Design an enzyme around this catalytic site. Structure first.
Site, PDB file in Angstrom:
ATOM      1  N   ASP B 164     -11.120  -8.860  -2.756  1.00 41.15           N
ATOM      2  CA  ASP B 164     -11.379  -8.831  -1.320  1.00 41.15           C
ATOM      3  C   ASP B 164     -12.887  -8.895  -0.978  1.00 41.15           C
ATOM      4  O   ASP B 164     -13.317  -9.625  -0.061  1.00 41.15           O
ATOM      5  CB  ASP B 164     -10.712  -7.569  -0.760  1.00 41.15           C
ATOM      6  CG  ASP B 164     -10.540  -7.579   0.745  1.00 41.15           C
ATOM      7  OD1 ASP B 164     -10.761  -8.621   1.404  1.00 41.15           O
ATOM      8  OD2 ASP B 164     -10.153  -6.505   1.266  1.00 41.15           O
ATOM      9  N   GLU B 395      -5.405  -3.201  -9.931  1.00 41.73           N
ATOM     10  CA  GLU B 395      -4.328  -4.103  -9.519  1.00 41.73           C
ATOM     11  C   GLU B 395      -4.169  -5.352 -10.386  1.00 41.73           C
ATOM     12  O   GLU B 395      -4.113  -6.470  -9.873  1.00 41.73           O
ATOM     13  CB  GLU B 395      -4.526  -4.512  -8.059  1.00 41.73           C
ATOM     14  CG  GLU B 395      -4.533  -3.321  -7.109  1.00 41.73           C
ATOM     15  CD  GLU B 395      -4.549  -3.736  -5.656  1.00 41.73           C
ATOM     16  OE1 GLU B 395      -4.580  -4.956  -5.393  1.00 41.73           O
ATOM     17  OE2 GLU B 395      -4.531  -2.845  -4.780  1.00 41.73           O
ATOM     18  N   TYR B 451       0.112   0.902   0.354  1.00 40.11           N
ATOM     19  CA  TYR B 451      -0.115   0.672   1.772  1.00 40.11           C
ATOM     20  C   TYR B 451       1.195   0.697   2.556  1.00 40.11           C
ATOM     21  O   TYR B 451       1.462  -0.177   3.395  1.00 40.11           O
ATOM     22  CB  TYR B 451      -0.838  -0.644   1.973  1.00 40.11           C
ATOM     23  CG  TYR B 451      -2.261  -0.589   1.484  1.00 40.11           C
ATOM     24  CD1 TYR B 451      -3.269  -0.085   2.294  1.00 40.11           C
ATOM     25  CD2 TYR B 451      -2.599  -1.031   0.209  1.00 40.11           C
ATOM     26  CE1 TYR B 451      -4.569  -0.034   1.858  1.00 40.11           C
ATOM     27  CE2 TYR B 451      -3.911  -0.984  -0.240  1.00 40.11           C
ATOM     28  CZ  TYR B 451      -4.892  -0.481   0.595  1.00 40.11           C
ATOM     29  OH  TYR B 451      -6.202  -0.425   0.166  1.00 40.11           O
ATOM     30  N   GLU B 489      -5.851   4.163  -3.358  1.00 38.59           N
ATOM     31  CA  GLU B 489      -5.984   3.382  -2.120  1.00 38.59           C
ATOM     32  C   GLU B 489      -4.838   3.680  -1.182  1.00 38.59           C
ATOM     33  O   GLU B 489      -3.686   3.813  -1.592  1.00 38.59           O
ATOM     34  CB  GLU B 489      -6.040   1.876  -2.390  1.00 38.59           C
ATOM     35  CG  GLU B 489      -7.263   1.447  -3.173  1.00 38.59           C
ATOM     36  CD  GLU B 489      -7.430  -0.056  -3.247  1.00 38.59           C
ATOM     37  OE1 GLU B 489      -6.833  -0.772  -2.407  1.00 38.59           O
ATOM     38  OE2 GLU B 489      -8.172  -0.518  -4.147  1.00 38.59           O
TER      39      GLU B 489
END
Lengths: 574, 574
Positions: B164, B395, B451, B489
């Site tokens: 990102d 990840e 998330y 996260e």
């Protein structure tokens, strides 16, 4: 009054037709309209929404900022059946002053931009034909009408308010044409007494004739609970369902004029059985103390300006309920009638404020205007259960015997107009020091606007601010006035999205900290019995170096979303 | 390693001189620099601050987005007294890969943009003269080095990250030229054992010679508390003052090389006596459970990019302490060494992360790069008391036996490099389902990036999100792995100033509600022992339709101010 303030209704005896929509509109910078036949039609109009403030539609400064004479026109078809009724144009308001024409004839003029204007067109109306209405309006500010200000001439005129809020104007509320019977209910007043589980509704009725009057009271289901005869009387209500704070109950009063075995007129309105009185330092609603929690508001919304819309009412009340508020002040002018109707429904308490903001020999004329507005406001709003107090000024000079004699007359007039004699007050600016102020004795309870922590000792000096605040409140306490105090303004300009650690003036965090400090002070004095924050929402002002797109002391944004501090109010008022 | 990772110091035996300042700089789009003598000086440079990322200085897109080869140059005067010392250029980092030249000679090359680059210029250095350093740097992304991505050719190159964060590059950390004695301390390792009120400091020392070594331990006042002889030994500390979470205590280790009655070299560094171990589902610091509270961060600041500055460290730590945090992860790459030094001072816990983000035969080469970065990170950072865990991936794919064999090698290498054998972990993306993942058994504790409520069932579906979350955690619970879980996260993009009632995704209010929901889930499982929110602050990303000026999952803004949700963390972690 030479006319009725009663909200228009539709039934067998009364008709109404809305004139809302796109009107014709034209600016008159040279002031030649009445010299040039404009009352028979505008020569080169544009379209203008009604209801609305005109200012924020335009893309050019001179149209937005227009100050002076400007005209509205529309046409409407009058049903033939309205023949030989009393036919009236009813403007929710005309801001600030204007002259109404119908079918080329001057009908009436009005001074005061926040209360209904009634124009009797009975003698010029053409039933079964298209009719024409033309309004000449003026939005200048002076020192002989409310709200006060000046007019600057650049020959272009510019309004120079003595008040913060933007000088919105035009036809900001709905317009009706209505038909009434030749003998009609013109006015009525109700007052309440609580008797154990029962209640008395005391009333007076004014009609335009000499025929008998019957008065009925219906409950929320439409069931008859009381009936009496006479223009003056008492309605006896068994096991009355009282109108309560945030828990409304509304009866329906039905006023009939009769002629033997037939009805001549019938007026109905929802009312709420409730009492309000000041007892010592307490505000009593239905005999129980209530602590006022809420905001000063405005009639203010993007693009529409002060234009009325039920959607704004609905959102605002949902926001108000979410904060656990129970009260708002109609700062700084009477609002559209619909706001009070809804407050009645939702059980909100209202302090109803005349536009006496922005306060020479001109003063005798100003006093007349101020009294006239007070009479109109009270006659219009007295029968709303939500309205529990009248605010008769906002931040005037009060420290001279001169100011005292002026307000003595205003308060005396208000007293004669209010059948209920409910509490009267006014909002005092800080300059009205406890040792100097001559006018607070006129008040049933005292309202203070204070910005300790914003205009006084803000930011790094906020601890000093708190001491200064306590010092003044200690001075008030020492007077032992034995009356309630309500804070009707306190707040900080707060830019949504402005975050800072540590906080700075204008940040969302400082707004929270400022409020917390004020609460500590409020809660330190037994006689403080209300807190109405400034403001419910960000609102438009005159532009200038101190105003970053209007006033940002809102707890909500202008589009009605909560800043961080809104939660602080919510948690405290719960 | 063919060089020392030891932070440079200045004393009787070691010298250092900063090369920070304005360097010369030139883009090399045609890749002709090495063909055209650029290693002897750039032909048409501009000035470029060091340390800094180059991208955000420029006002044109093609310079900001430059991808490919680009060059730095500076000159420095070398003191004559440095003659016949081992002279090194030390770059905090060179991003992403580069070749160092000095006085026209190729010295060394390095792959990996977030760890020190050492270049031995002993044989080409000119003491008592002006010297020249030229660096050829490349910032392309591929699948054989970390962090992974691709390079697109429009002949203009464009970096296409598989991660990102924005592809910042250049000389982002301080550069030194240093002088060491011919026989020097190259490396050392400490490990701790707690013995009642006393402590053992176990150590190893590596030097570049065969002369005797003496090791001393000084307390925070500089008092001698322990001394021993040998490159391997134990320092016995009576009444040890342990390094504690948010309550640091730092001793000073002093390593001397001696030749009869004289010292040849002396290295000193502050260390902290503390133990970390995983016991069942608990994380133990000095034998007591600790619950991790904090954030993933970035090296990211307006204009400087990833450029190091102590001011950013100071503000960030004050913000961290204000939230009552005790921990951060160095997402997604080792940070400048100075961050760890300060964490040591402030008693913060760090999860130190290698840039294994953005995860064909290329894989064997990728594995070599990944292992090399791991070796360098651990050798650089092992003696910081703050560093209590290594994160060896973020990840990656983990659900094939192929992925398992890859990470088995990485973890094995990490184990051989860490004298302390402290906990090793990696951050798992949601696709690493509990029924499929093959790699979680490699971990001392498990880190989850989740998330639920943002990428999964966000907004109106947030109640569904919570059930889905509980469903997965129930699946983890059923495995009875008996290891701690840390969320590394979780967060929502949140535009400062975006307020909505009711909340919407992207509003400040939704960020609060999302966090509250996640906390409820966290607190429902005994084996969850840490929560590191994504992210400490808004940070720059590749531009695109999903990124409104970078990533807005910050709890703070990019200029380090709190959104509404920052208070939520503060209150919970208190």
């Amino acid at each position: 009054l030479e006319y009725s303030e009663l909200y228009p209704i539709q039934n067998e005896y009364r008709m109404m037709q809305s004139l809302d929509g796109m009107w014709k509109f034209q600016f008159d910078p040279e002031e030649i309209g009445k010299k040039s036949g404009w009352e028979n039609g505008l020569p080169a109009p544009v379209s203008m929404p009604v209801p609305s403030s005109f200012a924020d539609f335009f893309t050019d400064h001179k149209e937005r900022d227009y100050c002076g004479d400007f005209w509205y026109e529309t046409e409407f078809y009058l049903p033939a059946e309205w023949r030989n009724k009393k036919i009236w144009l009813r403007f929710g308001s005309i801001t600030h002053r204007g002259t109404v024409y119908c079918n080329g004839m001057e009908i009436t003029s009005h001074e005061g931009g926040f209360l209904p204007v009634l124009a009797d067109i009975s003698t010029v109306a053409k039933p079964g034909q298209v009719n024409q209405v033309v309004v000449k309006i003026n939005n200048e500010l002076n020192e002989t009408s409310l709200p006060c200000g000046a007019t600057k001439i650049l020959g272009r005129k510019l309004a120079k308010p003595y008040f913060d809020f933007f000088n919105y104007s035009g036809l900001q509320r709905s317009v009706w044409v209505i038909a009434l019977p030749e003998e009609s209910v013109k006015d009525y007043s109700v007052d309440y007494e609580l008797c154990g589980t029962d209640a008395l509704v005391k009333y007076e009725v004014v009609t335009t004739g000499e025929h008998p009057v019957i008065v009925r009271l219906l409950d929320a289901e439409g069931e008859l609970v009381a009936e009496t005869e006479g223009k003056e009387g008492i309605l006896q209500v068994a096991n009355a369902r009282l109108w309560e704070v945030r828990n409304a109950y509304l009866y329906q009063i039905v006023i009939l004029i009769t002629d033997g075995n037939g009805v001549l007129d019938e007026y109905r309105e929802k009312i709420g059985i409730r009492t309000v009185r000041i007892e010592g330092t307490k505000i009593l609603l239905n005999d129980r103390p209530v602590y006022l929690k809420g905001f000063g508001k405005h009639e203010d919304f993007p693009i529409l300006g002060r234009g009325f819309h039920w959607g704004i009412v609905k959102r605002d009340f949902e926001c108000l309920k979410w904060t656990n508020a129970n009260c708002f002040r109609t700062s700084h002018y009477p609002y559209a009638e619909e706001w009070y109707q809804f407050a009645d429904e939702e059980g909100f308490l209202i302090i109803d404020e005349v536009p006496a903001v922005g306060m020479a020999l001109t003063v005798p004329e100003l006093l007349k205007s101020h009294i006239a507005d007070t009479e109109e406001m009270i006659t219009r709003d007295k029968n709303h259960p939500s309205v529990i107090a009248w605010s008769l000024f906002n931040e005037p000079e009060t420290i001279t015997d001169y100011a005292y004699e002026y307000f003595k007359e205003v308060f005396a007039a208000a007293e004669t107009y209010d059948f209920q004699s409910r509490p009267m007050t006014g909002a005092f600016e800080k300059n009205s020091k406890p040792e100097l102020c001559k006018c607070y004795p006129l008040c049933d309870f005292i309202c203070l606007n204070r910005y300790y922590g914003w205009y006084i000792s803000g930011g790094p000096e906020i601890e000093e601010a708190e001491e200064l605040f306590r010092d003044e409140m200690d001075r008030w306490k020492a007077k032992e006035l034995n009356v309630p105090f309500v804070f009707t303004e306190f707040g900080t300009d707060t830019m949504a999205g402005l975050h800072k650690l540590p906080s700075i003036m204008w940040s969302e965090e400082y707004q929270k900290e400022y409020l917390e400090m004020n609460f500590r002070v409020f809660d330190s004095y037994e006689f403080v019995q209300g807190e109405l924050a400034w403001n419910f929402a960000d609102f438009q002002t005159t532009e200038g170096i101190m105003r970053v797109d209007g006033n940002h002391k809102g707890v909500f944004t202008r589009d009605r979303q909560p800043k961080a501090a809104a939660v602080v109010f919510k948690d405290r008022w719960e």
